[PDB]
């Protein structure tokens, strides 16, 4: 529940999480995202009628597996790595 509202970076593009749960028909864990660029998206958020999360674009939202999402580091670690 606390994961909602956090920004992540996938494929170099920034996105925001809006739903964390099961997204049928494909079982398994899933984390909905909202790509800033709607050109990369595919749907508004719903799928097969089940409305999981809404967005401000008819084609700006997808689902990514947990391991395929990077939340990022903080300031000190970033400065150290740079």
Swiss-Prot record:
Instruction: Please report the stretch or stretches of sequence annotated as the CAP-Gly domain.
Output: 21-65
Give its localization. Cytoplasm; Cytoplasm, Cytoskeleton
Q: Give the signal sequence positions.
A: none
Q: What does this protein do?
A: Tubulin-folding protein; involved in the second step of the tubulin folding pathway and in the regulation of tubulin heterodimer dissociation. Required for correct organization of microtubule cytoskeleton and mitotic splindle, and maintenance of the neuronal microtubule network.
- Which disease is the protein involved in? Hypoparathyroidism-retardation-dysmorphism syndrome: An autosomal recessive multisystem disorder characterized by hypoparathyroidism, intrauterine and postnatal growth retardation, psychomotor retardation, epilepsy, microcephaly, and facial dysmorphism. Kenny-Caffey syndrome 1: An autosomal recessive form of Kenny-Caffey syndrome, a disorder characterized by impaired skeletal development with small and dense bones, short stature, and primary hypoparathyroidism with hypocalcemia. Clinical features include cortical thickening and medullary stenosis of the tubular bones, delayed closure of fontanels, defective dentition, small eyes with hypermetropia, and frontal bossing with a triangular face.
Subunit structure of this entry? Answer: Supercomplex made of cofactors A to E. Cofactors A and D function by capturing and stabilizing tubulin in a quasi-native conformation. Cofactor E binds to the cofactor D-tubulin complex; interaction with cofactor C then causes the release of tubulin polypeptides that are committed to the native state. Cofactors B and E can form a heterodimer which binds to alpha-tubulin and enhances their ability to dissociate tubulin heterodimers. Interacts with TBCD.
Recorded family membership: Belongs to the TBCE family.
**What is the designated name of this protein?**
Tubulin-specific chaperone E
Counting on the full-length protein, the chain here runs from 7 to 88 of 527
């Amino acid at each position: 529940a606390d994961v909602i509202g956090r920004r992540v970076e996938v494929n170099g593009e920034h996105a925001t999480v809006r739903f964390a749960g099961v997204v049928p028909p494909v079982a398994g864990p899933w984390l909905g995202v909202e790509w800033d660029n709607p050109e990369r998206g595919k749907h508004d958020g719903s799928h097969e009628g089940t409305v999981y999360f809404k967005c401000r674009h008819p084609t700006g939202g997808s689902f990514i597996r947990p391991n395929k999402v990077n939340f990022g580091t903080d300031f000190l670690t970033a400065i150290k790595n740079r």
